[PDB]
Symmetry: C3
Subunit: 406 residues, 3 copies
Amino acid sequence: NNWVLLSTVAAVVLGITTGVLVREHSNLSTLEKFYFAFPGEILMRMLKLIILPLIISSMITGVAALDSNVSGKIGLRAVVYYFATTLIAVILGIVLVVSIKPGSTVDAMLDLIRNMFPENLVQAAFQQYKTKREEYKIVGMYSDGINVLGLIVFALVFGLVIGKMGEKGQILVDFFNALSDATMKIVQIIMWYMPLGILFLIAGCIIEVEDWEIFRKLGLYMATVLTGLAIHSIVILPLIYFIVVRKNPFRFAMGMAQALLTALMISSSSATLPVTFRCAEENNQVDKRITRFVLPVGATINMDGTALYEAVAAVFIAQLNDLDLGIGQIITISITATSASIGAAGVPQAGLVTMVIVLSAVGLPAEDVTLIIAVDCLLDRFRTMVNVLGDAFGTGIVEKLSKKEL
Amino acid sequence: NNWVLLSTVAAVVLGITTGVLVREHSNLSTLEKFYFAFPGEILMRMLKLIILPLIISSMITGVAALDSNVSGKIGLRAVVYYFATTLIAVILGIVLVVSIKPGSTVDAMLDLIRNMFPENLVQAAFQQYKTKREEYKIVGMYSDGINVLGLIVFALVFGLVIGKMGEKGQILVDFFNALSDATMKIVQIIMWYMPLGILFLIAGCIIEVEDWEIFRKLGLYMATVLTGLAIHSIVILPLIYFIVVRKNPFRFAMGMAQALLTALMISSSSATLPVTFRCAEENNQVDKRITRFVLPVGATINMDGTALYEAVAAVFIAQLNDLDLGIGQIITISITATSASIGAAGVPQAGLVTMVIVLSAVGLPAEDVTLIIAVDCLLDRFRTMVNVLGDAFGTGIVEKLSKKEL
Amino acid sequence: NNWVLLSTVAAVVLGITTGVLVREHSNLSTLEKFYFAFPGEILMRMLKLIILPLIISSMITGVAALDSNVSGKIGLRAVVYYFATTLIAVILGIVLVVSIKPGSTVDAMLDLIRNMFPENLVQAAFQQYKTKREEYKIVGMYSDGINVLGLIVFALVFGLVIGKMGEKGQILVDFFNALSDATMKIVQIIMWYMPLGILFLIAGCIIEVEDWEIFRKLGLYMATVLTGLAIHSIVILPLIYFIVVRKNPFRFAMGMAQALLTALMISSSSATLPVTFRCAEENNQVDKRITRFVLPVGATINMDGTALYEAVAAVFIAQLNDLDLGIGQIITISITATSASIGAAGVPQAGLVTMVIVLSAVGLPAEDVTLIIAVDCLLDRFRTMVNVLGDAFGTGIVEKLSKKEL
Ligand SMILES: N[C@@H](CC(=O)O)C(=O)O
Ligand SMILES: N[C@@H](CC(=O)O)C(=O)O
Ligand SMILES: N[C@@H](CC(=O)O)C(=O)O
Ligand SMILES: [Hg+2]
Ligand SMILES: [Hg+2]
Ligand SMILES: [Hg+2]
Ligand code: NA
Ligand code: NA
Ligand code: NA
Ligand code: NA
Ligand code: NA
Ligand code: NA
Ligand code: NA
Ligand code: NA
Ligand code: NA
């Protein structure tokens, strides 16, 4: 049966029901509220567990599947589509948030480059590099947090190398192919727990707000993000599809509707990836040759919704601090929000972990994330859907562009 | 020649001879006593080095060898036998130690679940998660120590997935098969150093006791553990064998006598595993199809002797602190001593590393292990033999149970 | 075109030109001098990134390629040549530096043995063990820094095991063969950035010296190292070649001249390894059977120039501190400088990272490396060439010795 979507929709409505009723008709202490969320914590453990094997294997196999530079044009065309749509999303976000106004830079910018090239691969798998100036002289240290941006850069370069080796590298192509499949089979196992975990992860999040004045304060911030995500997903992406693929874009989006609902409930572009393959191949009849690369790479590299959210959220917190952003600061937000979408993994609440980078790029305390944290579970559900939809339209686009070489 | 056992028996009697003579006829300072133990430290380095490759590869290959759910019944029947015998050992230990009386809980219990699902596999390979409440709000951090409990859970789930993939996963079945064999060949290399390391590791341990009043104080604690291990290995395990396999159990145990002596000297269920295969297959004529799974998995998951020792040791230290354990606390010791036997690796002195968890489950300082540490090298030799014997009887039992499906 | 050497020679002369002109005609602050070096920092990131995959895979494949103990004599003969030439280099360095005089030991010596056998392979990939005595009792802790000495020992032992397994281990032979090749293909990608990175890494190093009185102070230290490296490479190595291979040694060295210039510019024995294979096989016509083992293992194990430099540098800093070295201390420098050359990786500035060990072996502060750091980029270029030349002559030597078994 079509259990995945119906069970998760039930968990969402049961999570809201539980949270609203428990928040009103009970008085949990700050400690009891933490144990109440525990079944959702264990879900977040299981998903953070799997993003290391998943990102590594999907980067390597995706790139290594480009047998030669002729097929390499399919991969190249896709990464151009990824960067183009992400910048348009960030620019749209900045234009909105400075129109609505809902409210050490060099070191944070060079730290982006240092984190693409980590000094150690094993350390990069769980720690990330930060530099500070003191007395100035620069001092750097590692702090915990998977260096996803550096593992991506290595896995793309390492994937490219393996594919060029031909029959000499095939054992590594085969090893990471099997490891990629084994990882997607483990993710499908987590999907059995995910409905129950999503219930407590939704219920616990709305139990942890003391007053709706917190929700009213952030109402105009949600309007800015949800306005941007609406414009991006309903105007921009359908338009650039139609400009390339002279077919109705909403006909293509309607075929993904089962994947978009999944993304809108589980808040994980990586976990909805099996449903994305199902829709893209069978409803939209896209060539499996390209869907094997554009979907699994784009499921983490191409996060248009996160990039927009990061830019709106960072400028919003700057406005809350009266930090009147100059055009130079706006540009450093744009660059960091672009990189933060790439560095962010496709698991629930990955946008917040990278939010610290965009805040640091303008010197804002890393703890000012706690100004927006309360509503994030709502905007996370919508940004995830744009993270998938951006890849879906890209799959149809890349087919039309590549048709001379497929 | 049969060098392994005769050389290790010599090292044990030479270690006692050296330690007793050096303790009486010399006056090493606390510093010189540490350098005297150094050849035994390097042995402990070599064995801690190998338990990561060994646990990972033996979990994956053991489970992945269950070609289908028909053979999967052999693996399922075994894990039921593992859990049953371990609980009986823990319950026996608790009953004894409260009869003889030789003398934050929720956070430590939820930390067990958080450590089955680590946020990072590379971090889990060398760090383990602990939470504290402060101001309450819960704060968590990682501290060093291989998260064996989380690597087991992943390797069993990852092994299950690979086996279901069939011909698509065979490269990973083959890779971990070779890596499992390569690890057992390295362990056989350490066995050449082990006699010399065991000499200094035994001699140094009895040089580090200042007075025999330490040994007299712990005499009734040793009587409780060694009474429990005697009852478990001479009464309970032979009985549950006979109740399943209507054959004389001591005839089967006599065939293992060469493996039991090895375990009783090297204090390592993992290092004696090659001898366990030799006896189980050739003396006891057990089907190689089942011995390939019950022995190498049970060599670390099924540690009946450690589980009994953990429960007796934790209640003993509680009695030393006048911490009069309620029935609720006794239950939390039972659950944690069960998990601590699984989390403990099959290398000399692995019971102490996990002892900290059972102590923490009742709020006892982690340093109160130093109350029992002095005698542990003796009880380690006996608990190791029950850790092997539990797997040996399980191998004969699982054969009888599975005979309809072999 | 022969772009590698001509482009790097240009970067060196352009780096000196830039550094001298910027140092005179500009006044960078200590902060601006750090950002000026940044394009060279990113080069050091890329090379430190790759030494973990490179050392692991080259140890395993090199040893695992010795199909049997008959070919094993080729590998055995080589490691005898490695240790012999390294000790001769260290002894030459000690004799010089005590003739010219240009100016807790047990714990540091046992720490060498503890670091050959790490308690964890994943921790060894990025941390290294150090012990201290306090109140004495010994306390140990891990600190960051790849434990190259322990990864080598495991990879040689693990490589030996795989080769003995035959057809049962071939999947691991194949896996590390492909991973070794994939790593050398990534290093060849870094070579495209290396000219630009070498320019700023040379220019920035001479911008960071305030006065030439620093260079005059260290002039007699450079004379001691460069005298030792001249004697070792022009006298000793040609002699031991001629004593084994009764052919003109400078005819063989002239065939390597393209590899020696590469080593003398990029300061990386590992990065010049492809050029070393090219010269050794095609100019010097050495059997590919032996060059496949003596070059890639010797590219990190056999560092005769580093070992000489380490001994001269450590005794020099002792003389600066009036620490009048007894014959016992000289011996502990010899042992630690030998091990430090093995522990040092073949990337620019790897000698300094291990310098801390030789200083610690005689109790000198780890920060007294900053007494010699200023000139190190110059001596690094010359020591790298002796690190390659030692392997080159060894390749011709091992061919003559092994000719009865090839
Ligand atoms: N939850 C988003 C990631 C994010 O929130 O940044 C996704 O999986 O696409
Ligand atoms: N030494 C035991 C483990 C322990 O003491 O906990 C064994 O190897 O079975
Ligand atoms: N740069 C040297 C290593 C060192 O300086 O210690 C080499 O690659 O051979
Ligand atoms: Hg929420
Ligand atoms: Hg002992
Ligand atoms: Hg320099
Ligand atoms: Na994009
Ligand atoms: Na995406
Ligand atoms: Na991303
Ligand atoms: Na058991
Ligand atoms: Na066991
Ligand atoms: Na265990
Ligand atoms: Na040498
Ligand atoms: Na070398
Ligand atoms: Na070296």
